[PDB]
Amino acid sequence: FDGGSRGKGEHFPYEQEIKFFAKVVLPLIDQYFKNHRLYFLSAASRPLCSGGHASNKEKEMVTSLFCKLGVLVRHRISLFGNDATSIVNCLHILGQTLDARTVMKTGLESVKSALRAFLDNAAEDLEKTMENLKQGQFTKGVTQIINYTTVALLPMLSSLFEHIGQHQFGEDLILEDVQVSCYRILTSLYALGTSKSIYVERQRSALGECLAAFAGAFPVAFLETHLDKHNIYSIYNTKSSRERAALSLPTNVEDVCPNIPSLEKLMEEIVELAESGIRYTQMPHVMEVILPMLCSYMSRWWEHGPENNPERAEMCCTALNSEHMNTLLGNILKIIYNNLGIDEGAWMKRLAVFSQPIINKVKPQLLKTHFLPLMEKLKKKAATVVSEE
């Protein structure tokens, strides 16, 4: 149809096939996988004692179906019309249902290549959004690409990375070419978050969820990259200068993330944030995107921290602590306290949702007589006539 769209075939004969697909096949997939998600996520572990576990070939077919649906949805939301929501929801539910561990351990090379190519295509589309959004705001291909991104790529990637982080599939999936593609995706997400442009503040949020999900999912501490040698799962510690030369790398540990500053730099930024007293409207990107990334990073990297690992504490890639957590959360509630009176929005609620994992993580001894300020402010501000929360 795309080959002969402008040709003699303006009316494609296969209306029956197209209608049957878009009206039955997609919603059936969505509902079936929503109902039987536990069957496909089953493994050697037995969550569902009654039902059996999906076969390895079964999970291979699930991954193949997800990859094929992604290939279909690439750059064709406008041609799908109003069904694009249906296709993206099917991709969402399939992404939850995937079992990357078993797929990588015993999977078809075609399926593995399809997954790698899907991730590489996501990275390439993000780079195309880079190159056109930069000096493309004056000016269609650019409009189609940006619509495709903002509609599908952010939800798809966010859902997939949330699943990967929740099931710790990153150590089994994100490696070699997959890992360099994820590096490109991370650089792209950070550049979109940091950059200022009308198309950016029109979709700041979805970038926020996608980037936070990626931060949770990625198996390398990109923030505290100085402790690179300790991590065993990094390309810089596994597959060496020969493959630096073979496939292109930034070739420097600190240059792998040129636009991404260091963890201590972001910590200092958030400390003098709300203390320098700058306006929300000047640079809204930190409390909307960066703090979610910090929270996801700490939530993922706590258990690898030195205070959680007294054994070989010198052999840890990350150096987070409960004092880091309480300082960052203190900066969070200082920001909300200084910004609740003016510039009201749902972004405070979204930030609180994003920070829910860290307040769950923190020990209740601090909750005593440290979050007492939190509850007293949250009640005195809610003491208004209309009640909430």
Binding site: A44, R46, C49, H53, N56, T106
Partner: protein
């Protein structure tokens, strides 16, 4: 009954026979033993590297039969072994081998580069099954001979110290047999006949192997201690983690019926994180070993609550009430299953 000879191994049975002979002699000589004049236990020497006149023909037959039994057991495991390439003989090349390690029997040793072959955990599992099965076959043969288990070797009374299940076997002997058989499997892989073997998926096992008369035991307080008014509390420490229920029961609760399957008991089950009364509903969390569950009942307001390690357990909704509506009746007593 199911055993058949695999269809491409007829003409190769001989070559496999002398191949197993080669593995047997090389394994015997590189287990640390060496050719000697006379057989002694303290000498740790193997004088049997001599002409076939004295060499046990029964031992030769045992070697051949255990080789064929080994291959029959791999085919029984589902290993539809495949012929890959003849090029194994071309690829195998003689490394540097010392004069002492060189066999004086006259045959040329063929120690191959066994390091680079990566043993996939599936073949490790079949190796475990091969060890178990070979040990079982040996035990069966000894029992047919009349051997019986003992603390130490007694030839007069035919008491064997090693006659125990392989799972409980001593480390040294199981390690020795295990390395011998991994060497055998690795030599088969070196000749290149690849193991097209199935994978043993995890199978659910009910694990209930107690007396058929009882799948559970119920402990309760006396009927006369039933409380009908007030706020009462007790504790239940779980030394293990598994099928256990704790709660409050009517005086008429049956002992042979599971707690919470009827109207006579209100229970909490931490194995599946559920609450039980006339049915099953999700509630609370799952305990672990050493966890203490505190059960509270309030007969004034007709409510029940459960706490795990101090923290109050709550159902899908935000309520902390495991059970909120019940008639006082004849009272409640602490109970567990």
């Amino acid at each position: 009954s199911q055993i058949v000879l695999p269809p491409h191994l007829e003409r190769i049975r001989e070559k496999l026979a002398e191949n197993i002979h080669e593995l047997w002699v090389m394994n015997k000589i590189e287990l640390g033993w060496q050719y000697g004049p006379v057989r002694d236990d303290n000498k740790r020497q193997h004088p049997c590297l001599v002409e076939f006149s004295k060499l046990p023909e029964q031992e030769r037959n045992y070697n051949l039969q255990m080789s064929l039994e080994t291959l029959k057991t791999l085919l029984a495991l589902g290993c539809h072994v495949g012929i890959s390439d003849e090029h194994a003989e071309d690829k195998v090349k003689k490394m540097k081998l010392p004069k002492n390690y060189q066999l004086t029997s006259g045959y040329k040793p063929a120690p191959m580069d066994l390091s680079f072959i990566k043993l996939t955990p599936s073949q490790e599992a079949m190796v475990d099954k091969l060890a178990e099965n070979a040990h079982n076959v040996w035990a069966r043969d000894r029992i047919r001979q009349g051997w019986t288990y003992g603390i130490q070797q007694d030839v007069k009374n035919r008491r064997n110290p090693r006659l125990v299940p392989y799972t409980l076997l001593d480390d040294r002997t199981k390690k020795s047999n295990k390395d011998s058989l991994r060497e055998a499997v690795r030599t088969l892989l070196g000749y290149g006949y690849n193991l097209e073997a199935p994978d043993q998926d995890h199978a659910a096992r009910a694990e209930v192997c107690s007396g058929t008369g009882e799948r559970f035991r119920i402990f309760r307080a006396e009927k006369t201690y039933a409380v009908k008014a007030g706020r009462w509390y007790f504790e239940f420490e779980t030394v293990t983690a598994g099928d256990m229920r704790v709660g409050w029961s009517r005086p008429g609760c049956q002992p042979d019926q599971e707690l919470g399957s009827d109207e006579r008991a209100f229970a909490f089950d931490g194995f599946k994180a559920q609450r039980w009364h006339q049915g099953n509903e999700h509630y609370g969390r799952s305990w672990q070993a050493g966890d203490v569950v505190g059960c509270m009942v309030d007969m004034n307001e007709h409510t029940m609550m459960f706490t795990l390690n101090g923290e109050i357990l709550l159902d899908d909704s935000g309520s902390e009430l495991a059970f909120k509506d019940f008639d006082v009746g004849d009272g409640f007593i602490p109970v567990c299953s």
